Design an enzyme around this catalytic site. Structure first.
Site, PDB file in Angstrom:
ATOM      1  N   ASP A  53     -17.612  72.986 -16.323  1.00 26.05           N
ATOM      2  CA  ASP A  53     -17.394  71.556 -16.531  1.00 26.05           C
ATOM      3  C   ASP A  53     -18.538  70.940 -17.331  1.00 26.05           C
ATOM      4  O   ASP A  53     -19.458  71.644 -17.746  1.00 26.05           O
ATOM      5  CB  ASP A  53     -17.204  70.826 -15.198  1.00 26.05           C
ATOM      6  CG  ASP A  53     -18.470  70.782 -14.362  1.00 26.05           C
ATOM      7  OD1 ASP A  53     -19.553  71.137 -14.878  1.00 26.05           O
ATOM      8  OD2 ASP A  53     -18.378  70.375 -13.185  1.00 26.05           O
TER       9      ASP A  53
ATOM     10  N   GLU B  77      -9.499  65.037 -14.813  1.00 22.73           N
ATOM     11  CA  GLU B  77     -10.019  66.400 -14.630  1.00 22.73           C
ATOM     12  C   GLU B  77      -9.375  67.419 -15.564  1.00 22.73           C
ATOM     13  O   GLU B  77      -9.934  68.494 -15.799  1.00 22.73           O
ATOM     14  CB  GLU B  77      -9.819  66.859 -13.180  1.00 22.73           C
ATOM     15  CG  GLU B  77     -10.501  65.981 -12.136  1.00 22.73           C
ATOM     16  CD  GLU B  77     -12.002  66.215 -12.066  1.00 22.73           C
ATOM     17  OE1 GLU B  77     -12.513  67.078 -12.813  1.00 22.73           O
ATOM     18  OE2 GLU B  77     -12.676  65.539 -11.262  1.00 22.73           O
TER      19      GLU B  77
END
Length: 175
Positions: A31, A22
């Site tokens: 993202d 992540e």
């Protein structure tokens, strides 16, 4: 493997794993799917409205953040998110039996997968769950590689899939 290489598995755990997949970002960002995110993979909202993302952030952190948090705060939120994924697995009648059947490393891959996709998403992978429970690792990995989760954002999912295949931490070495 050298003495050092044999120590590497003792340094890897779910926190280090997700941290790699992540990344760590102290400011709100989009993202790979363009969703507002912060810290270590914390999805704030799917809404395109940045104002909604900041609203969620101040709520999650408990102060007026204006889109920015500290490393410590990222860590706290991350720990909360990991706990939520674990609790989500253990209370679920479909996921728990599969989780229980897995070795320690694959259990991390499981928590990771749920952290990323959520409980209902993972619990819906009927075939993959059966394959994992039956220790059909190659087939499980191939089928995970068909998913939208992996294909829309391969770099975030690729190491998890490898981990389900091997049950080792090899995918997280040599960054």
């Amino acid at each position: 493997p050298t003495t050092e290489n044999l120590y590497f598995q003792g340094s890897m755990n779910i926190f280090e794993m997700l941290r790699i997949d992540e990344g760590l970002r102290l400011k709100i960002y989009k993202d790979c799917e363009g969703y507002y995110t912060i810290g270590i993979g914390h999805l704030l909202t799917k809404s395109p409205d940045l104002n909604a993302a900041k609203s969620e952030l101040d709520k999650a952190i408990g102060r007026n953040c204006n889109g920015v948090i500290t490393k410590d705060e990222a860590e706290k939120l991350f720990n909360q998110d990991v706990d939520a994924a674990v609790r989500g697995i253990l209370r679920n009648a479909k996921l728990k039996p599969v989780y229980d059947s897995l070795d320690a490393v694959r259990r991390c891959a499981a928590i990771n997968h749920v952290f990323q996709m959520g409980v209902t998403g993972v619990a819906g992978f009927t075939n993959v769950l059966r394959m994992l429970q039956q220790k059909r690792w190659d087939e499980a990995a191939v089928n995970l590689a068909k998913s939208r989760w992996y294909n829309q954002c391969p770099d975030r999912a690729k190491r998890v899939i490898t981990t389900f295949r091997t049950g080792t931490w090899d995918a997280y070495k040599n960054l």
